[PDB]
């Protein structure tokens, strides 16, 4: 059996400031979901047939439901509240931020009239102890999702069944596949890389 508990964060709380960059953080997570769907063929519904490639959520921000957007936006809080755990802090240095971005240009097949479109953040490089970084956060993140679905009553099984509440990924990260360990830890680089692009720097406190 398995236990997720992930760092502490119940006494630190977030300044109002920090609200701004939490919106942005949450938006630009939600783009490179539904581009790796695409990428994965899935098509449109407003019903939910699994082996006809159809799903509902796969449309803007602002359509989605308000009990499942909820979700995206606290996670996106516990990150930013986990930095400051560490005795780090983030202030905004570079004023020279929000006009120098874009977002990519993915060809016509991308497109029900929604195309996803995530910020372009490719030339932003990181120092050895910020990417040092991205690697303790990206397993504290597994285990806050793991700490939810405990108390949300998900078991191990060896199919997935949405009838049953069951997922086969429910082990510790050391008996994580690769090929899952990597994308939890490419989504912390795009959100280090989405607090650089508005200007923030990340040192101690
Ligand atoms: N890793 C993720 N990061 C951000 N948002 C996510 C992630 N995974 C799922 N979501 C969001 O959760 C919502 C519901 O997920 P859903 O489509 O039911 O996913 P799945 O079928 O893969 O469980 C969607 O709006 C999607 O954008
Ligand atoms: O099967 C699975 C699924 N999963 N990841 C759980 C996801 C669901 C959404 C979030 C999420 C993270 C970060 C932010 N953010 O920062 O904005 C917003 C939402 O975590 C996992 O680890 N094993």
């Known amino acids: ?75 996106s809080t516990e990150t930013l509240k986990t930095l400051l755990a560490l005795g780090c802090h983030i202030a905004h240095v570079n004023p020279a931020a929000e006009e120098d971005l874009k977002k990519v240009k993915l060809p016509k097949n991308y497109m029900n009239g929604y195309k996803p479109a995530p910020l372009d953040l490719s030339d932003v490089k990181l120092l050895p102890p910020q990417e040092i970084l991205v690697d303790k956060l990206a ?15 998900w078991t191990y099984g060896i199919q997935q069944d949405l009838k049953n509440k069951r997922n086969p990924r429910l082990v510790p990260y050391a008996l994580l596949d690769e090929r899952t360990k990597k994308s939890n830890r490419d989504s912390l680089r795009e959100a280090v890389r989405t607090f650089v692009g508005y200007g923030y720097n990340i040192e101690p406190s």
């Open 1 to 75: 059996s398995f236990i997720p508990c992930p760092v502490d964060t119940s006494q630190v709380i977030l300044p109002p400031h920090l609200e701004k960059i939490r919106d942005r953080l949450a938006e630009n997570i939600h783009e490179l979901w539904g581009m790796n769907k695409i990428e994965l063929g899935w098509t449109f519904g407003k019903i939910r047939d699994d082996n006809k490639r159809q799903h509902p959520c796969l449309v803007e921000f602002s359509k989605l439901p308000e009990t499942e957007k909820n979700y995206n936006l606290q996670m």
């Open 139 to 153: 397993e504290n993140a597994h285990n806050v999702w793991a700490k939810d679905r405990i108390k949300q009553g």
